[PDB]
Amino acid sequence: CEYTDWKSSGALIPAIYMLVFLLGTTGNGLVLWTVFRSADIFIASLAVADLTFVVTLPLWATYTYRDYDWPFGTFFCKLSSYLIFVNMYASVFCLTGLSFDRYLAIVRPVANARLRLRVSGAVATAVLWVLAALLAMPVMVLRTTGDLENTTKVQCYMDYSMVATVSSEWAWEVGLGVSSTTVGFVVPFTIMLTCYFFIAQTIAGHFRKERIEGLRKRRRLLSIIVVLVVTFALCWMPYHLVKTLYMLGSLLHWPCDFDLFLMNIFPYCTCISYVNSCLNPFLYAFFDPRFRQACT
């Protein structure tokens, strides 16, 4: 049923792309500059990942505002798409590794000390970056440019038939989306969920103090764990869920109104994911009282 106009979006989402550009770049510079001046290595890696996840956005802001003109390069389509994909993967895996190290340290005092030592800060960051690159290289190799609807203006589209089956590029894009889901949202958020539940029950067991300081501890730490889990959920559930929902839309053939809502809502959940990536420094790394004092 298409109907993909939604007049109000045409000037708002690029504007949202623009204002998440400033906060993401400035916010990540604030955390990064302080590291220059273990868990801290993960903090630096995550700040870098989100920063270079946000920097290459205004190229897409022009793409959205000028009605799929895409003037900002020809292979810069590939460059920006690769940077954003690899750095979203890196941000997710940095959250995975940082929560994993926290889980080790909190739930096992010295039983997981060896696990902390083998994970380290350099080796885990290196391996997560390598996995992110391996998972985002197809974005480089298939991000074709030009030929907006094969005519007219220039578009930054995908040719899934080049390396996969020529007959069904749709099958390859379904598989790529399914892998992206199950590797960058489903399983990593499972790691956050289990590790953070173990951390929270560790507080519930060991921090059982009836003193005023004890209750303050319970409130603060339990709140921060639930907020981290909830913010990753609230910022990745709608975006990934809507990819999946429209994917069934190509298959299950929902009534038009549903897919109309998905088309009018996809840019906005993209925006919320990007803006939560932008605020991730403040909520996770800058949240650290000692690191925040160092920044101050």
Partner: peptide, 13 residues
């Protein structure tokens, strides 16, 4: 219904 979602935003998926 034809858009393969690889437009507008950066992510092609």
């Amino acid at each position: 219904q034809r858009p393969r979602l690889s437009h507008k935003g950066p992510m092609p998926f």
